[PDB]
Design a protein around this ligand. Structure first.
Ligand SMILES: *[C@@H]1O[C@H](CO)[C@@H](O[C@@H]2O[C@H](CO)[C@@H](O[C@@H]3O[C@H](CO)[C@@H](O)[C@H](O[C@H]4O[C@H](CO)[C@@H](O)[C@H](O)[C@@H]4O)[C@@H]3O)[C@H](O)[C@H]2NC(C)=O)[C@H](O)[C@H]1NC(C)=O
Ligand SMILES: *[C@@H]1O[C@H](CO)[C@@H](O[C@@H]2O[C@H](CO)[C@@H](O[C@@H]3O[C@H](CO)[C@@H](O)[C@H](O[C@H]4O[C@H](CO)[C@@H](O)[C@H](O)[C@@H]4O)[C@@H]3O)[C@H](O)[C@H]2NC(C)=O)[C@H](O)[C@H]1NC(C)=O
Ligand SMILES: *[C@@H]1O[C@H](CO)[C@@H](O[C@@H]2O[C@H](CO)[C@@H](O[C@@H]3O[C@H](CO)[C@@H](O)[C@H](O)[C@@H]3O)[C@H](O)[C@H]2NC(C)=O)[C@H](O)[C@H]1NC(C)=O
Ligand SMILES: *[C@@H]1O[C@H](CO)[C@@H](O[C@@H]2O[C@H](CO)[C@@H](O[C@@H]3O[C@H](CO)[C@@H](O)[C@H](O)[C@@H]3O)[C@H](O)[C@H]2NC(C)=O)[C@H](O)[C@H]1NC(C)=O
Ligand SMILES: *[C@@H]1O[C@H](CO)[C@@H](O[C@@H]2O[C@H](CO)[C@@H](O)[C@H](O)[C@H]2NC(C)=O)[C@H](O)[C@H]1NC(C)=O
Ligand SMILES: *[C@@H]1O[C@H](CO)[C@@H](O[C@@H]2O[C@H](CO)[C@@H](O)[C@H](O)[C@H]2NC(C)=O)[C@H](O)[C@H]1NC(C)=O
Ligand SMILES: *[C@@H]1O[C@H](CO)[C@@H](O[C@@H]2O[C@H](CO)[C@@H](O)[C@H](O)[C@H]2NC(C)=O)[C@H](O)[C@H]1NC(C)=O
Ligand SMILES: *[C@@H]1O[C@H](CO)[C@@H](O[C@@H]2O[C@H](CO)[C@@H](O)[C@H](O)[C@H]2NC(C)=O)[C@H](O)[C@H]1NC(C)=O
Ligand code: BC8
Ligand code: BC8
Ligand code: NAG
Ligand code: NAG
Ligand code: NAG
Ligand code: NAG
Ligand code: NAG
Ligand code: NAG
Ligand code: CA
Ligand code: CA
Ligand code: CL
Ligand code: CL
Ligand code: ZN
Ligand code: ZN
Ligand code: ZN
Ligand code: ZN
Lengths: 696, 696
């Protein structure tokens, strides 16, 4: 039989290992020749694997690169203007890679040029709340100051934005061992920890879903009209550079001024973590000087797009997509993902050569320039928006397959909760001590749901990865899955070697997944999801799961508002309409579920009607007017958090209207806008519900 | 057989006559009790006629009414502040209607209150070009002046906007006999001409498709959050009032200052038509004073929505919709339309009682408050936008069935050209001297196409009627048809009695269509279109007709640009991408047409795929970012003209970027924006084309 089991059994750990090794020997930075060559290889292999068509889709987008003959660096500079300390020009390359060319040195992509000079201020993680504490409680003024912040907690772009709005003239980012050095584990190459010379690369854009900064709304094709750099979306306005903790210790050790307000402002370096401004009396005459010469350049990028045509519904698209571009070798990010996608394509292709086709069309994507703002996925979605919104069933992301080896992590739309539970009950756990048990069992034991005993945690989709255009702009049901760490035992952030030169094949092979069993499990989850989405006769979405979470989110947003009872009285702020809409959604979803079970399974138009209602349900949560000042974030239920692009926020329109509302100067206007957002949310929920009513 | 012929034959002239009489005995102004009662009657009858469900959909929208105890009027006022002449408080009621209550006196709906006083300036039709001539060529300054303009040429809202931007403090609108008095025809009640006391009512909003001024984007439902009046969409900022030509003669006869620049500024009144400002020396001390006390009030409105469920594709909607609200009796506008809709419902209902159902679902609509800004249709579309955009096949409008008795007039999407040609070849001509000939023949002879011999004129859809939200916001294929006058023999504007108290049943019965044969023909065209749209196995859209017009429109826009050859050289302005997109659309449409003819007619999913490609083709011309500063006008090919809401403009984004470009202060920026609009248009055409490519 050609069934999901045949698909799953053909997937091999050893193939994934082989592909990972193949993908990680040289750097594959977006816009470079090496990443074009890898795109061509992938295209060629996907054809060999049996896909019906495989094309490159290219775009000319704004990228950012250091200047090869004028390196970026930071100095301590004395009263005489002598540079007494310089940060590193590159990370010490790992063993055996010391002769690899084109390792891009650490830099913050899209930094403007500058040589700003001034006094340091230490801003902890540069979060909204960290700045509120500096300005409001400690009375410290960042205007004209070079701010130094530790990576972590939130997306680095949010940090640079928060810094800019506080008036800083420069940002230095660093990795504190408190956040990137797991206790008792060796530094690379002898374990998986960040060494003192390791540095986290990364873009510092605030695109809010726009894609290429120069062409918001429209693909960056050959005839594209581009904004001028001055009108570009999302570029930082002050220079920024990342450093490791050895270099950071040299810049922090002399800090004077105010003490840290508490232990949550202190990392693990042997320094006071004084906020500043400036250095201590002996050194109060010294200052910090940045030297940033990176340039922004319109550069060609290449997505690989593979098609496996559906036998029955070729006009319905299930997309499996992940990025190919890396900062350096991409051992985890993204090649642990891409290797999995490669094997999934190979397995579907095997079935296809034996005469099988999925019911629906499967699209496979190798996205470019994700590291520079999700540009490849976004540009392609902008080009094909009409096709995607009328034909897009679901999107399954495929970035890094592992960030740990403890248990499964799933983030998805509530429409896929049931699919995920049912699939994981049929997969084997790869975990130690769960031999012969299901993935569902090991996952549920290690990551229990905070609400329901006997079920696992599934998180909301936020952003910061290539599902973003599909889910938050277009309203296509989306999900992602990977192996992760134990967040209880490990307070540290992401994984220590994230976006560093030390993210290699050897890192993975030696320290994360020697048997490639966690990779195989992830291939089975991602692959299995795609298989069911593309082959199940009735789409495997349970609208009733949406009803459940909508009530939870309405309860939560109401709780936030109810911190201001006097204002709710004064401005007649009622959540009644939102609760009524959620109630109606629950009732109508329940009736729809009955019809979907009891409908005449013989009739294909009836089947197609009800599959269309399921497909367009996620779509119904899109507001074509977007969110305030964020036209590309259109999902009324989910939007990336305005304080941390990484995290999901629910009813973001109402949440943002309530945020820090007690500080607004005109409370009548601010509570008016809360009421407006309540109306918009209620209406949207009711409108979504009504898509599931009988059609006529 | 239950076929289109059975449907057509059941339609009766005498029924339409009976319904017209029934609908026009009393006023049915939006928001009044009489129009609620008529909505209830229509609902009850549509149920009796056999529709599966008939509901009222209500909204609370901003309307506008004169103050019953403080009438609006205009004065000539002397140096002493004595009112020496007053305009009329009402139109002399027509014979036998002199005791009808609740005839709303003439007024300009949504005028603010005021009593401005000042010197008259005469602005001809208050068009863009008329103001360009006043300011640029004649050096006349309208700032602080009360402007008097004649109705005609363009939508009256555009006039008041043009006036406001010229700095006027008030607008007086009037009907000049040059534009509303056909030579040799008697005034009502002895013929169909406008008498001197007749007055054209009408709203003066500039909504740009927004609907209810207080709730743009979202239905004005029970829990709606409303803008404050200060932030409302589209309200005029200076007082405005309409008058008849007797009253206008009294205000114009004393005009001094500059002579009219030419005979195109002179109407037919026995006055000089001097531009002003002010009156002649004897009377230079007198001024004009307006007295406007109308109030804007949130008021409930009611649409009637009838459903005839499809037997095979109940989730596909063909909509027949027209308004019910009138300024007074609505003898032509809208009841000549609504009576036709009533009979069409009755005829579909007859078939339904004998066991027939259309293939697709038919929705019938009686819209409210069209006269106040298309509010009923727009609010309902806003509420149901998700359903309409995923399920909406087509919209057929049904306002006034007749504005003349000379020949047919059709305005529609190119997707319906073939449908209209084929239907009209099967209908009988009702025209004198064309007995036994087809409607196509009489129509083609009387209104020849300007491009193709042997075909009739079909015009573009613009706006100013209830198709607007469906076509220009949502991108649902739309059309309209009515009987019209001979535009060669009749230079006058619309029909003389438009929006006056004299628009009665008797007007129609005596002077337009005594046998109700033109009404019957219009019922057959509108009804026949609906029938084919709802019953044809393959949707009756020819994508190749779109290709043809897209080339014509690209040629036209290029011609406009080529008035500025030096600038096209200097700024490298190329139309190559747009022509390439149009070429590709033509080729891909041609291939699609072959597939649609040659496809396996046995397979229902293949049939549904290709019908979806046809349905979503109009949809593909929607830009979710809208047009600049007009978010509710989203159709890239068609948008109401920025100088005349009534007329269609093609490639409006590029047209508006080129308009008066030689006056822009920064040519580099202005030509940049032209290039941006070319990119957007090219991309959109190509994207639309690609919806017709093979799906995988
Ligand atoms: C969830 O679904 C339910 C349907 O089960 C839906 O109920 C609807 O709620 C509205 C209230 O928001 C009801 O509106 C009424 O409609 C009648 C005519 O049918 C009117 O007479 C009512 O207006 C009078 O009373 C008002 C309130 O005091 C006054 O403000 C007003 O001026 C009038 O005097 C009122 O408009 C509606 O009938 C029900 N529908 C049904 C079928 O019960 C509810 O709205 C849904 N929730 C959401 C968020 O959509
Ligand atoms: C209408 O349909 C046709 C397809 O039949 C479509 O043609 C495409 O046009 C573009 C040009 O806009 C071609 O783009 C090229 O793609 C190749 C790779 O496939 C590149 O090497 C080319 O780039 C080089 O040359 C450029 C031009 O001098 C340089 O600017 C560039 O830096 C490179 O050196 C170029 O990108 C494309 O191949 C064709 N596609 C096909 C299948 O022929 C046309 O674009 C469609 N019209 C619209 C408006 O979409
Ligand atoms: C995930 O797995 C669960 C458990 O199997 C699925 O739910 C089950 O779905 C089936 C098929 O629709 C339901 O069976 C039907 O039930 C009624 C009688 O109760 C009747 O129409 C038929 O006799 C038929 O057997 C079954 O009740 C239902 N079970 C539960 C506990 O809900 C679920 O659908 C799967 N999810 C996905 C996305 O596939
Ligand atoms: C309006 O009427 C015209 C004229 O009848 C319709 O065009 C005709 O459509 C038919 C049916 O698709 C075409 O017939 C087919 O043609 C090919 C061979 O040439 C073959 O597949 C079959 O043998 C079949 O007969 C016919 O050629 C075509 N005629 C013309 C002149 O185009 C048109 O489709 C109608 N429009 C609408 C919207 O219904
Ligand atoms: C990654 O694997 C690919 C595919 O096996 C290798 O590419 C092949 O390289 C050989 C030269 O050794 C050529 O004969 C083939 O034409 C290549 N095939 C394709 C599809 O590109 C590639 O060399 C491997 N890369 C590394 C670093 O091991
Ligand atoms: C930090 O790097 C700078 C730049 O290379 C060094 O400064 C240069 O040193 C030479 C002489 O040693 C001067 O002639 C250049 O003009 C200097 N350039 C600048 C911009 O100052 C500096 O020595 C380095 N400092 C340390 C401690 O390594
Ligand atoms: C328009 O026609 C309707 C329907 O025939 C008339 O309404 C009926 O009026 C009688 C009273 O004479 C009642 O018994 C019915 O209940 C009414 N029916 C409905 C459906 O409303 C209406 O009176 C006619 N109006 C005019 C002005 O002639
Ligand atoms: C135009 O109408 C106004 C308002 O009714 C008339 O003016 C009023 O006339 C009486 C005496 O005749 C005064 O006591 C009122 O105070 C006047 N009101 C105002 C606002 O002036 C006026 O007579 C009318 N003019 C004509 C020519 O009919
Ligand atoms: O530009 C963006 O929005 C994100 C690009 C890129 N994103 C990633 O690397 C991520 O894997 C995105 C993700 O997994 O959600 C970062 C993370 O989760 O810590 C970045 O954060 O630098
Ligand atoms: O508010 C609007 O946009 C138009 C409402 C209303 N429209 C009409 O009366 C029309 O019939 C609209 C139409 O037929 O396109 C006016 C006309 O064509 O002369 C009006 O013009 O006053
Ligand atoms: C690199 O830096 C030098 C010095 O400013 C400059 O002349 C050169 O053009 C730079 N290269 C780029 C690509 O900007
Ligand atoms: C912070 O410092 C600068 C002085 O250089 C001043 O201009 C700025 O307004 C200050 N901000 C506050 C909030 O005090
Ligand atoms: C891999 O698994 C075991 C967990 O007990 C451990 O040796 C190691 O810390 C894990 N690796 C990582 C990178 O978490
Ligand atoms: C009508 O006019 C009078 C005089 O200004 C005013 O007192 C009354 O309230 C008005 N009515 C309305 C509905 O505004
Ligand atoms: C027109 O007249 C007024 C004088 O009342 C003046 O303020 C305004 O600027 C003038 N406009 C032009 C264009 O001259
Ligand atoms: C109706 O038809 C004939 C056309 O010859 C004529 O008597 C009359 O002018 C027409 N009516 C109108 C209103 O155009
Ligand atoms: Ca873009
Ligand atoms: Ca509205
Ligand atoms: Cl992922
Ligand atoms: Cl019409
Ligand atoms: Zn990644
Ligand atoms: Zn990354
Ligand atoms: Zn009308
Ligand atoms: Zn009208």
């Amino acid at each position: 039989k050609h069934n999901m089991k045949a698909f799953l059994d053909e997937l091999k750990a050893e193939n994934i290992k082989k592909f990972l090794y193949n993908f990680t020997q040289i750097p594959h930075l977006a816009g470079t020749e090496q990443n074009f060559q890898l795109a061509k290889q992938i295209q060629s292999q996907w054809k060999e694997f049996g896909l019906d068509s495989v094309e490159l889709a290219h775009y000319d987008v704004l990228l950012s690169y250091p200047n090869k003959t004028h390196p970026n660096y930071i100095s301590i500079i004395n009263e005489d203007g002598n540079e007494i300390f310089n940060t590193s020009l590159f990370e010490p390359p790992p063993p055996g890679y010391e002769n690899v060319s084109d390792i891009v040195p650490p830099f913050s992509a899209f930094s403007p040029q500058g040589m700003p000079e001034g006094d340091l201020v230490y801003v902890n993680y540069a979060r909204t709340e960290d700045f509120f504490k500096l300005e409001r409680d400690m009375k410290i003024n960042c205007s004209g100051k070079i701010v130094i912040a530790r990576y972590g907690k939130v997306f680095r772009g949010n940090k640079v934005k928060n810094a800019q709005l506080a008036g800083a003239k420069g940002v230095i980012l660093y990795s504190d061992p408190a956040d990137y050095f797991a206790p008792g584990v060796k530094s690379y190459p002898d374990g998986w920890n960040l060494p003192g010379g390791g540095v986290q690369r990364g873009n510092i854009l605030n695109l809010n879903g726009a894609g290429d900064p120069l062409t918001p709304g429209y693909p960056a094709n050959e005839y594209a009209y581009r904004r001028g750099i001055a009108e570009a979306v999302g570029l930082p306005s002050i220079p920024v550079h990342p450093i490791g903790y050895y270099d950071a210790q040299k810049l922090l050790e002399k800090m004077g001024g105010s003490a840290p307000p508490d232990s949550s402002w202190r990392g693990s370096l042997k320094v006071p973590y004084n906020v500043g401004p400036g250095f201590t009396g002996n050194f109060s005459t010294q200052k910090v000087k940045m030297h940033i010469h990176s340039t922004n350049e319109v550069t060609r990028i290449y997505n690989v797009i593979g098609t496996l045509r559906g036998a029955v519904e070729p006009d319905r698209y299930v997309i499996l997509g992940g990025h190919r571009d890396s900062w350096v070798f991409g051992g985890i990010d993204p090649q642990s993902g891409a290797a999995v996608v490669h094997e999934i394509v190979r397995s579907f292709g095997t079935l296809k050569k034996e005469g099988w086709r999925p019911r629906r069309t499967i699209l496979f994507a190798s996205w470019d320039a994700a590291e520079f703002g999700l540009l490849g996925s976004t540009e392609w979605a902008e080009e094909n928006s009409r096709l995607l919104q009328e034909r897009g069933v679901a999107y399954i992301n495929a970035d890094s397959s592992i960030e740990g080896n403890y248990t499964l992590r799933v983030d998805c739309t509530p429409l896929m909760y049931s699919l995920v539970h049912n699939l994981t009950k049929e997969l084997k756990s790869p975990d130690e001590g769960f031999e012969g048990k299901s993935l569902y069992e090991s996952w549920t034991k290690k990551s229990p749901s905070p609400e329901f005993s006997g079920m696992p945690r599934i998180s909301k989709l936020g952003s910061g990865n290539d599902f973003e255009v599909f889910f938050q702009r277009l309203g296509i049901a989306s999900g992602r899955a990977r192996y992760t760490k134990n967040w209880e035992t490990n307070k540290f952030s992401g994984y220590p070697l994230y976006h560093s030169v030390y993210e290699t094949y050897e890192l993975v092979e030696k320290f994360y997944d020697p048997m490639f069993k966690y990779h195989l499990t992830v291939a089975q989850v991602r692959g299995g999801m795609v298989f069911e989405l593309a082959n199940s006769i009735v789409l495997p979405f349970d609208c009733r799961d949406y009803a459940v979470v909508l009530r939870k989110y309405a309860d939560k947003i109401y709780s936030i508002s109810m911190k201001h009872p006097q204002e709710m009285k004064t401005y007649s702020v009622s959540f009644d309409s939102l609760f009524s809409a959620v109630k109606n959604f629950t009732e109508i979803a329940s009736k729809f579920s009955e019809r979907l079970q009891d409908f005449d399974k013989s009739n294909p138009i009836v089947l197609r009607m009800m599959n269309d209602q399921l497909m367009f349900l996620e779509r119904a949560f899109i507001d074509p007017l977007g969110l305030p000042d964020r036209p590309f974030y259109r999902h009324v239920i989910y939007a990336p958090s305005s304080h941390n692009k990484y995290a999901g926020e629910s009813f973001p329109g109402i949440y943002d209207a309530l945020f820090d509302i007690e500080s607004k100067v005109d409370p009548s206007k601010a509570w008016g806008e809360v009421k407006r957002q309540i109306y918009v949310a209620a209406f949207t929920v009711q409108a979504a519900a009504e898509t599931l009513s009988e059609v006529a």
